[PDB]
């Protein structure tokens, strides 16, 4: 029979943490953008997410990197333009 083991660190994997979400986004707006991200946000508006992810994948390591990064930049645009 099983004995229902104690919880560990990455089982509550990335516990939300209201404060660190705030801090990361707080630095994101203050620091500006890196020269490639500065090109990337111009590239979404003109050429779209297609070529944007292509450049991001070549720039970064893997494709899962480029997913999170282009979406991150899409939220930069989504906040700066509307709200």
């Amino acid at each position: 029979t099983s004995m229902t083991p104690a919880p560990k660190i990455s089982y509550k994997k990335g516990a939300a943490s209201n404060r660190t979400k705030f801090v990361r986004s707080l630095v994101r707006e203050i620091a500006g953008l890196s020269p490639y991200e500065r090109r990337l946000i111009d590239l979404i508006r003109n050429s779209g997410e297609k070529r944007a992810r292509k450049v991001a994948k070549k720039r970064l390591g893997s494709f899962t990197r480029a997913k999170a990064k282009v979406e991150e930049m899409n939220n930069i645009i989504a906040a700066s333009r509307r709200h």
């Binding site: 029979t1 099983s2 004995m3 083991p5 104690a6």
Partner: protein, 122 residues
Amino acid sequence: PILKNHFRKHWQERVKVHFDQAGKKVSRRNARATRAAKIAPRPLDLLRPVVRAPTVKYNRKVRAGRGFTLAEVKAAGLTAAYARTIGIAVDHRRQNRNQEIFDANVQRLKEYQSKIIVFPRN
């Protein structure tokens, strides 16, 4: 017909012959005698748990573990920090999943707690 001889290197520099087998047995027994002369009423070793070995090959066998757990110690009716002062080895990284192993250890702890005589600090 096969044979492989690893004597292509300068092997004659690193040849360790254990003449001190008889000398080192005496040396460990003197070490135990000293430790038991310094740790007078206590055994010479911590109370170790019962544990099932890994791998399809050895999962038939029951062996000594490193330490119990916070779970097995709590179920016995004491704390991990206090168990170490009574000479019960505690393993924080080990997990409890098998009921038979668990109960065997708890009874090993309980029988240990009946047999001991803890000295007061005065």
